[PDB]
Amino acid sequence: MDVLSKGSLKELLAHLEKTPLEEAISYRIGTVPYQNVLISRNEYYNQLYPDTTSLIDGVSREGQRNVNGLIMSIISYVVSGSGHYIPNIGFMLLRRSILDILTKHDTGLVTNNLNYGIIARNLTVSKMNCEQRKRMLICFKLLAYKDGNQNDYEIYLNQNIPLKQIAPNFIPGDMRTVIHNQDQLAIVGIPAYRLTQSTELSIRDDNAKSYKLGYVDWYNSNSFLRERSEFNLIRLKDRDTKYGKLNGW
Amino acid sequence: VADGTFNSMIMPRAVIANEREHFMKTRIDKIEHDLNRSAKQEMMDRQSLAEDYNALNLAVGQEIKLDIATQHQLNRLGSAMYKADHERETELTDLINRIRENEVTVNGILENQKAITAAERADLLLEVVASTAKSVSAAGRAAADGSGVVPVFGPSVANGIKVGIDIADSVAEAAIAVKESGIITQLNDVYHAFQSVHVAPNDVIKPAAVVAGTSTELIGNLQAIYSRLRSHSDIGFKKATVGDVIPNSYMIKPVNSTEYASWQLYVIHPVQGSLGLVVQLMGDALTYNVFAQYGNTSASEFGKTVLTGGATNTALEGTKVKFQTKVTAQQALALTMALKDAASMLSQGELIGYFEQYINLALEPDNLSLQDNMHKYHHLLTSQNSPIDWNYHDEEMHKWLDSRKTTNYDAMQKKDGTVIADIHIPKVFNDLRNTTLHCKLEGKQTIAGYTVYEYLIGPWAHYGDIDYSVVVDTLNEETKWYCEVIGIDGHLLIEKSVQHKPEKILELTVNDSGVTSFNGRNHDRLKLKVYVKDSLSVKVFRNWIGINAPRVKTKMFNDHIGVKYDYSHFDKNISPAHLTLTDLGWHTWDQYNAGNWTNIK
Amino acid sequence: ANRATSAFLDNPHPVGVNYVDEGSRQFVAVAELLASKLIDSSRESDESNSDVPFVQAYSKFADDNPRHLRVKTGGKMANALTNVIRSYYSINAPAIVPQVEIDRLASKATVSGDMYNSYAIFNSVPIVEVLSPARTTVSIVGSDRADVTMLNTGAGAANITFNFGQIAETVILKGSVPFQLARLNQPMPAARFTYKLRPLDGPFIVVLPVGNPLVISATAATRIQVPLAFNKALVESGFQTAMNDGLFDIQNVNYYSSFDEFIISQYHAQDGINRVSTCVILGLALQAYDQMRRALPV
Amino acid sequence: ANRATSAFLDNPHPVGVNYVDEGSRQFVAVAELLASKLIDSSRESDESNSDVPFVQAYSKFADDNPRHLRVKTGGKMANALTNVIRSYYSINAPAIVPQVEIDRLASKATVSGDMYNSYAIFNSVPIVEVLSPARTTVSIVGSDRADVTMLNTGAGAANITFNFGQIAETVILKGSVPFQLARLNQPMPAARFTYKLRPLDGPFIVVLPVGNPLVISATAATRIQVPLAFNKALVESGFQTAMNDGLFDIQNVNYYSSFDEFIISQYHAQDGINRVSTCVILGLALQAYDQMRRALPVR
Amino acid sequence: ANRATSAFLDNPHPVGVNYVDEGSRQFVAVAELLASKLIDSSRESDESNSDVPFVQAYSKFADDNPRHLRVKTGGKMANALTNVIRSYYSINAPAIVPQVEIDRLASKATVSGDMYNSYAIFNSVPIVEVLSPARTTVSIVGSDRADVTMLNTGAGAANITFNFGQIAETVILKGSVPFQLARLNQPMPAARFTYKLRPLDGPFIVVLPVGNPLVISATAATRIQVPLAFNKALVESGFQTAMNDGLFDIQNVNYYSSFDEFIISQYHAQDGINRVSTCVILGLALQAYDQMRRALPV
């Protein structure tokens, strides 16, 4: 819910630096993806509504115990709000931040062999929306510059024209690019339209709506930080300053 | 859950682009050909074959001299191709017989069970009919393969033959003799780019029984498919006959292939067929174009396009890798249609791997949905509602090849003498079933010391007058060998004693429809059985009274359904050791007692 | 034995999965409402002898005032509506319109995107299969009124099986000459001109006598839940306008003569319930498109 | 000779004889007006996100304030309308609505119950009888656009007689190839593609050659007096809803694809001029029925 | 070779040439506007207990007050509207209405629009010619949905040429069984059920196998410029009323089943671009005639 509320490249990247990798993984076994299922949607129909389980739903699913599965779980957390079930990774990797896993060689993970075609295919990209695609392209760009595969990233974008049109423009090593970027990456927020407490047919839409109504409850709760009222109560380390920049950028 | 290691271990592999994967295959086909056909044996038996052909009384201009190098090379290629094709037809006729025996159970299988895959349906049908071969997998077909059905290997036949003999302005007898010993460079290039393909009846039953609902439909589909295959093989032999170098298939790949932007181009040039295929794989999009191998008046090899599936750019620049296809044009088109439909849910590796494996190794994909669609498209392309009108294209290929033969010979007859042109471009080697040829029969059945050699008479793709003869070599100095010809009404037994010489057994006439009148009944095929004690080799010779007998139109599904011929009588045998003089002649089944087809009773 | 099927029921292509949530549904409802005001502003302009009513209507629809040197296009909402329609037709079409733009346009007017508060009748007759024996010719022509031509060249009477699916509510059969029809394992009644039947009952057997051909005309009615603002006449015109403009021009998709055939064909897919909801939302978007483009041609 | 006729004109079942007086016509007119207000109030409720417009309209319709625990089906007015619709369709349908209810419901609004203010055009083409000789084959297919396929096998040209009734106002004939058509005892004109005929004018003879089949497409238009509130789009939609819900499942009745065929078939009966008036009343009730169910959905 | 054409495309009669100027066009728009107010007023009067809206609407329309004894003819506006409809149909019509009377009636109201402000979609399918070999037989039946039945009785497959003209935007072809179609001198594709074509692409060849007949169903969409007040439902019903009232009984004229067929036939002719302008004016006049007559039956 917190990750899905980030609306800018600065806020999203700042959140990924603070959060550790254990948030990306989940310890609930869940079910398996790519399975045709019959779910119950009684507000609309009496029969059982068919659908297909995927990795993009907000429910935890069993994942493969490899580097490919780890990256899919990280991107799933960013674009959906929940990750997968990959246990016994190791406390050394789980303490490090999501950004460090994505763009630092010191962690020890090897991601050079990863192919963006199957990752996009597995993390079903024909079913994503514009905001979800932009976040995935951010993760691909961060990984590509980590292993020096910028040329491969460009060729992949040139093959898929719609991805190129919405691809965010920022250099992973430069902080000026993050500041200048004005893409909207928010999947949840205060809605201008009328948001009701009703169900949606698809698994993806129902889970997304639950996060949206959950954010409204959290926005009006006591855990939210109203800057206009209590800006002098935050500590100096976490106060918003223009001089602030990501570590190593 | 799985680690994903087993999935990569069972992924299909590119068997054309990989140079390691091309070397290994070529070795095995060469080894397979040499084991079954030895160059030492064929060269040593050349003299025996030459005397056999001459001893057949053939009029001038209609006789073959294997003393000529070109005539000998053409004959071994013809005999190898005919033997493999002939063996398949006997296997098909046996399979049709078993189906007709159990039509009740076969009809139930075709109707009740329709949700299973094509392979599963074929396995159930084979088990019910109790056929000799009950495996539809690739390994089972390879394991249960006879010696004669092995495809012929081009370079092996052309190995170690003198090329380019030069005699200058000499008409002397000795110079003619030395000229005939060599072969022209064109024939060597043709043989280096020649490989044959002979599909098994087990591979054909999957397309035949994918939509069939009756035994008659299943039998008719099997006959219709094999009529097309035999016509394509006949075109293949004629292609090497004329004085033209045949094109051979190749794949174009990028000089420096990129990880994410790679394209593949396949150009299939089936030597046995009137049409070719061009397939392009750019991204996840597959585009195909079916062109006509005839015409090609320009420098480009491709003729006019007869079926379109997109835009294929054959002028791409990249490395060229060459291969020979083990599948027909119909099979290649069937797969490329299914791959195009299922391109969305398959990866790049699966698309390339499945395509290359089928073209190069005749390996069906392991995907069940892909296999079912492939056989459904295979049935459509060989049925009466096919997008391709085959009879038009095979006819046009015949006219184009005869025209090329005439202009190639006339071009040479100007450049050198008539005798030089004749020895280089023979006129007696037109078509595979038109030509005079021999079949080295093999026998594994011995009844009371008599080895049985079976032979299938027909079916005929040409009409006119045909003659059949046998040559029997036996270790004994004096023997008595019998020949039995089985029809529907009855069988005909003859007795001979001459050895080491061809002897005519049957004079047959076949009309436009391709059906002969054997003793007052219309027949489409007959069975010839030869019984010899301690035989070493038995060869059956066939020849047409006139050179280049006219063609008979290929039969489609409705032609096979209209006329039904019984083949159950081909199974029965006779015991020559218990023959009598009164039992030697043409007799019908009502004369014989039940179970003893040897004594009249 | 041969089998025949309706042409429009063959191979429905997958539909898009985006722009189905509440905010996107309210965007389509707002677009329909505001585009309707655009058409009515013309009649107000005639009565008021001035273009002010039209200018007000276009300003709300496009966020910009109309110009005389510019061709009126509709601005952001016209661009958003066009791109959203493309995504609905195929899963291969890109989802270009951002969510933020959708929410901003959905706040222009107060609506509820409830697409399940009414129903509509769809007249496409589904013939899933017609099984006939040998020496019998069966031809199926038509989509709104399906005519089945039957000829028996055999010696005796033949039994032909009909399968109308499990979705259509009623089917009425009218024959050129009186004929006999009954359900499976039921006795046949006297020859009648007209039969009313429920496809859910089961496959139907019709007796074909030997002689002159027998032609049966099939009319079916299906009920599909649609929003209260649905109008079939406007949706049908929007379908033809969008097809002409090339909004449906995308690779690996099927083409239908009318919206009636499109929705029924999708409903008879492997899981047709999943696609009915998206098709109805496409209908409302098409109804908005027809009104918007007729007022502002381009 | 062979006889061919349109399927939808065969044996029209008798229609109801009840609820046809002035008071019952007022009740149907009141229901149609109030059903329309219900559907407009349902749109206003959705737009304004308030139940005030719907509560006011439902109270005027059902005379009962909506309640959460109960189910909204239209109240007593809906019960009377649905059962009255059944009575019109067939004589065998029962009459169960008392006339104290009809008079009470007719007073909920002021409307002129006259059903002859305006007119409407119905497109069903009536082909009562097509007569052909022994050598020819004739097949009639269609209701809105009738397709007549004729094939001549005999040696000479044949004469086919077309009878379009006496009620249809105009009939337009079109042929796949030019054909010869004329009246009874009239010279045959040159072959043309399209003819315009008056069904009242007389039987028509078509000269059918021996070569190729001739397909004649017929389209008709007839005028029937209807109230000013009549709307064909709503009436047709109401007809299918009634058939789907089972309101027309009465014994010994005929079924029709559309309201077009129903009214024209009933018109061509022996006493059709009296049966059409009842059908028009049923048409208005069906339009009221359509608007009412679309406002109150039940799955 | 055999040629088969659609019946409604044969010999479009010349269309009248009077009452097509700016002043006359304004009169038709005013008549349509005033008639619409008349029918809307009549409904309100029936709904209410008083007849004020009809009295004012009829006074404006007819330039006189309604009377309980005299019949409501519609005034001089009804008389002028009836006669101009006659003149628009054929050039042989009298056209004797004074132009000064037209201008007087056109000054009653003012219209903020023209006859080219919008567009409408017409569903008639133009089949200019279908060319077939010696042995095959082709029959074309239908205007809204053309049904082409082709049968081959020769030795081998034949080629049928389809000419859809150059005016229609898109034509959708569906077949009873899968069939092959391709442009002229182009390779043929695999058999499919539905094709979408642009008639300007060129003549289309269809492969016809020997055996059971093939029936192809064609649906087309054409775009014609019309005023914003155009309504196809009202125009079509007005067309039928004009035919029944005998406004089209003129010598040496052609008769069509629908206004859609009439406008497409005129468009598919030499100088058809000039003819559709008058047909559109006639269409709007029929809209006024429908609304006026349904409010004032005679």
Could you give the C-alpha distances from E97 to D74, E16, E80, in angstroms and in order? 55, 14, 7
3-state secondary structure at position D205: strand
Report how this structure was experimentally obtained: cryo-EM
Q: Per the CB < 8 Å rule, is C96 touching A192?
A: no
Cα separation, B33 vs B39, whole angstroms: 10
Alpha carbon distance D229, E47 (integer Å) = 9
Cis-peptide, bond into residue B459, ω within 30° of zero = yes
Measured CA to CA in angstroms, residue A163 lies from A118, A153, A183, C249, E50 at distances of 15, 11, 14, 20, 65
Distance CA E68, CA E169 (A): 52
The alpha carbon of residue D107 and the mean position of all alpha carbons in its chain are separated, in whole angstroms, by 28
Q: Taking a C-beta distance cutoff of 8 angstroms, is the pair B108, B178 a contact?
A: no
Q: Say how far apart CA B283 and CA B352 lie, in whole Å.
A: 11
Rounded Cα gap, residues B311 and E186, in angstroms: 12
- Distances in Å between the Cα of A44 and the Cα atoms of B547, C28, C113, C285 are 80, 20, 14, 21
The C-alpha angle with vertex B358 and arms to B353 and B361, in degrees rounded to 5, equals 105
**Paired tokens of A51:** 């659908």
Please name which of B477, B476, B537 lies closest in space to residue B502, comparing C-alpha atoms.
B537
DSSP string, A29-95: --B-SS-EEEEE-TTT-SSEEEEE--SSSSS-EE--SSHHHHHHHHHHHHHHS--EE-----HHHHH
CB A122 within 8 A of CB A72: yes
In chain B, whose CA is at the least distance from the CA of E188? Answer: B307
Amino acid at A31: T
Give B23: exposed, middle or buried? Use CB within 10 Å, 0-12, 13-18, 19+.
Answer: exposed
Q: How many Å apart are CA C76 and CA C60, to the nearest integer?
A: 11
Task: Classify E45 as helix, strand or coil.
Answer: helix
d(CA E152, CA E138): 9
User: What phi and psi values does residue B344 have, to the nearest 5 degrees?
Assistant: -70, -40
Residue A47 tokens read as 């029969």
Q: Could A194 and C99 be called an inter-chain contact, meaning their C-beta atoms sit closer than 8 Å?
A: no
- Quote the CA–CA distance of B396 and B385 in Å, as a whole number: 20
Q: Are strands A61-62 and A84-85 parallel, antiparallel or unpaired?
A: parallel
E212 touches chain B (CB under 8 A): no
Give bridge partners of residue C197 from the DSSP assignment: C171
Residue B193 DSSP code: T
Are C60 and C108 in contact, with CB atoms under 8 Å apart?
yes
Beta strands in B448-502 (DSSP E): 450-457, 464-474, 481-486, 490-496
Answer yes or no: are the C-beta atoms of B229 and B199 closer than 8 Å.
Answer: yes
DSSP type of residue A22: G
Closest Cβ opposite residue B3 in set A64, A158, A159 = A64
B163: how many CB neighbours lie within 10 A of its CB? 14
Closest residue of E to B306, CA-based? E187
Q: Are the C-beta atoms of E91 and E17 separated by less than 8 Å?
A: yes
- Shortest Cα–Cα distance, C4 to chain E (Å): 8
CB atoms within 10 A of CB D107: 12
Structure tokens at C289: 């498109």
E154 at the B interface (CB within 8 A)? no
Cβ-proximal residues to C60 (8 Å cutoff; 6+ apart), any chain: C34, C37, C108
After which residues, if any, is chain C broken (C to N > 2.5 Å)?
none
CA distance C71 to C62: 13
Contact: chain A with chain C (3+ CB pairs below 8 Å)? yes
Q: Do A194 and C17 touch (CB under 8 A)?
A: no
Tokens coding B207: 């397309």
Residue E2 in tokens: 């055999």
Give dist(CA B527, CA B597) in Å, integer. Answer: 15
CA nearest B135: which of B78, B206, B44? B206
Dist. CA C145–CA E145, nearest whole Å: 11
**Contacts of A249 by beta carbon, 8 Å cutoff, 6+ apart:** A172, A173, A174, A175, A178
- How is residue D37 annotated by DSSP? H
Q: Which helix (H) or strand (E) holds C263?
A: helix C259-267
Cα D48 from Cα D4, distance rounded (Å): 58
Q: Do the beta carbons of residue B285 and residue B343 sit within 8 Å?
A: yes
Q: Which of C8, C50, C294 sits opposite E174 (nearest CB)?
A: C8
Nearest CA in chain C to E211: C137
Contacts of D75 (CB under 8 A, 6+ apart): D61, D62, D63, D64
With CA atoms as reference, report the closest residue to C109 among C220, C182, C34: C34
Compute the distance between CA of residue C37 and CA of residue C61 in angstroms, rounded to an integer: 9
Task: From residue D47, give the alpha-carbon distance in Å to each of A192, C59, E99.
Answer: 16, 21, 49
- Residues 129-148 of chain A with CB under 8 A from chain C are 129-131, 133
Read off φ and ψ for residue C184, nearest 5 degrees. -65, 140
Residues near B197 by Cβ (< 8 Å), separated by ≥ 6?
B151, B270, B272, B325, B326, B327, B328, B362
Task: Tell me the CA end-to-end span of chain D in Å, nearest whole number.
Answer: 53
Length of chain A, in residues: 249
Q: What residues pair up with B452 in beta bridges, in sequence order? A: B445, B531
Residue D217 neighbours by CB distance under 10 Å = 23
Cα gap B278→B291, rounded to integer Å: 8
- Strands, sheet with B464-474, edge to edge from the N-terminal-most edge strand: B437-441, B535-544, B464-474, B503-510, B516-517, B522-523
Amino acid at B400: W
Tokens of B217: 């439909």
Report whether B152 contacts B81 (CB < 8 A).
Answer: yes
D52-62 helix and D75-89 helix, angle to the nearest 10 degrees: 50
CA separation for the pair E81, E76 (Å, rounded): 8
Contact E177, E211 (CB under 8 A): no
β-pair type (D146-152, D158-163):
unpaired
**Is the separation of the CB atoms in E19 and E81 below 8 Å?**
no
Q: Which chains touch E (3 or more CB pairs under 8 A)?
A: B, C, D
Burial class (CB in 10 A: 0-12, 13-18, 19+), A238: exposed
DSSP character at residue B290: E
Is the dihedral angle over the CA atoms B206, B211, B213, B217 positive or is it negative? Answer: negative
Around Cβ B68, how many Cβ atoms within 10 Å?
21
**Interchain pair C21, A47: CB under 8 A:** no
* B450 beta partners: B447, B533
Quote the Cα angle for B375-B377-B382, to 5°: 95
The residues pairing with A38 across neighbouring beta strands, listed in sequence order, are A50
Q: Report the alpha-carbon angle B219-B223-B227, nearest 5.
A: 170
C-alpha C141/C-alpha C137 separation (Å) is 13
Whole-angstrom CA distances from B81 to B438, B443, E165 are 11, 19, 55
Q: Is the dihedral of CA D80, D86, D87, D92 positive or negative?
A: negative
Rounded to whole angstroms, what are the CA distances from B504 to A86, B466, B507, D79? 80, 11, 8, 99
For C118, the enclosing helix (H) or strand (E) is strand C118-122
C-alpha–C-alpha distance, residues A174 and A194, integer Å: 40
DSSP assignment, residue E117? S
In contact, E242 and E252? CB cutoff 8 Å: no
- Comparing C-alpha atoms, which of C90, C83, C73, C71 is closest to residue C28? C83
CB B3 within 8 A of CB A66: yes
Cα torsion through C169, C171, C172, C176, rounded to 10 = 170
Which three-class secondary structure string do you get for A182-224? CCCCCCCCCCCCCCCCCCCCCHHHHHHHHHHHHHHHHHCCCCC
Q: How far is CA D140 from CA A178, D9, D130, in A?
A: 75, 12, 9
Please give the single-letter amino acid code of residue C124: S
H or E element, residue E221: strand E214-226
Alpha helices in B384-517 (DSSP H): 390-415, 418-424
Q: Please say whether the beta carbons of E75 and E61 come within 8 A.
A: yes
Q: In the beta sheet, which residues pair with residue B493?
A: B484
DSSP assignment letter at B199: -
Of B396, B388, B441, residue with least CA distance to B294: B396
C-alpha of C94 from chain center: 22
Strand partners, C159: C207
Binding-site residues on chain D for chain C (CB distance < 8 A) = 4, 7-8, 10, 39, 42-43, 46-49, 137, 139-144, 233, 237, 240-241, 243-244, 254-258, 293-295, 297, 299
Contacts (Cβ under 8 Å, ≥6 apart) of C216: C147, C148, C150, C173, C174, C175, C176, C179, C206
Tokens 């739903």 sit at which residue? A57
Chain mean position to CA B39:
21
Structure tokens at D30: 């009141």
d(CA B401, CA B171): 31
CA–CA gap between residue E86 and residue E285 (Å, rounded)? 11
| C-alpha to C-alpha distance for B502 and B467, rounded to whole angstroms | 12
Report residue A88 as tokens. 């016994």
Chain A residues lying within 8 Å of C98, measured CB to CB: 130-131, 184
Instruction: Locate the chain C residue with the closest alpha carbon to D11.
Output: C193
Q: Could D141 and C118 be called an inter-chain contact, meaning their C-beta atoms sit closer than 8 Å?
A: no
Q: Which two tokens stand for residue D31?
A: 């229901």
Residue in this structure with the two tokens 């999957």, named with its chain if needed: B206
Residues of B with Cβ-Cβ distance to E182 under 8 angstroms? 308
* Sign of the alpha-carbon dihedral angle for E196, E202, E207, E213: positive
Which distant-in-sequence residues (6+ apart) come within 8 Å of B298 by Cβ? Answer: none
Phi, psi dihedrals of residue B586, rounded to the nearest 5°: -90, 115
Write out the two tokens for E258. 């629908």
Tokens of B197: 């393909």
- DSSP H or E segment with residue C36: helix C22-48
Please provide residue D41's backbone torsions phi and psi, each rounded to the nearest 5 degrees.
-65, -30
Residue at token pair 């007050």: E65
Give the largest Cα separation in chain C, rounded: 78
Give dist(CA B197, CA B325) in Å, integer.
8
- Smallest CA-to-CA distance from E145 within B525, D145, A107 is with D145
Instruction: Judge contact between B103 and B215, C-beta under 8 A.
Output: yes
The set of residues, in sequence order, having a beta carbon less than 8 Å from that of B498 and lying 6+ positions away, is none
The H or E element containing residue B77 is helix B69-101
The partner residue sitting opposite A193, judged by closest CB among C23, C95, C273, is: C23
Q: Does residue B207 have a cis bond before it (omega within 30 degrees)? A: no
Tokens of D189: 């004109």
Query: Which stretch of DSSP H or E encloses residue E241?
Result: helix E232-244
* CB environment C172-199: b (16+ within 10 A), e (fewer): bbbbbbebbbeeeeeeeeeebbbbbbeb
Closest by alpha carbon to D4, among D123, D125, D141, D124? D141
C-beta of residue A157 within 8 angstroms of C-beta of residue A169: no
Q: Read out DSSP for B258-286?
A: -SSS-EEEEEE--SSSSEEEEEEEETTEE
Task: Give the whole-angstrom CA distance, residue C184 versus residue C202.
Answer: 7
Give the Å distances, CA to CA, from B389 to B188, B374, B394, B554, C69: 34, 20, 9, 12, 59
Q: What is the 3-state composition of chain D as percent helix, strand, coil, each rounded to the nearest 5?
A: 40, 25, 40
CB D112 within 8 A of CB D99: no
Q: What one-character DSSP code corresponds to residue A27?
A: -
Contact E112 C51 (CB under 8 A): yes
Q: Which two tokens stand for residue C253?
A: 């998709």
Q: Which two tokens stand for residue E186?
A: 């182009």
D268-D274-D276 Cα angle (round to 5): 60
Cβ separation C110–D4 shorter than 8 A:
no
Return the DSSP state at E96: -
Chain CA centroid to CA B541, Å: 18
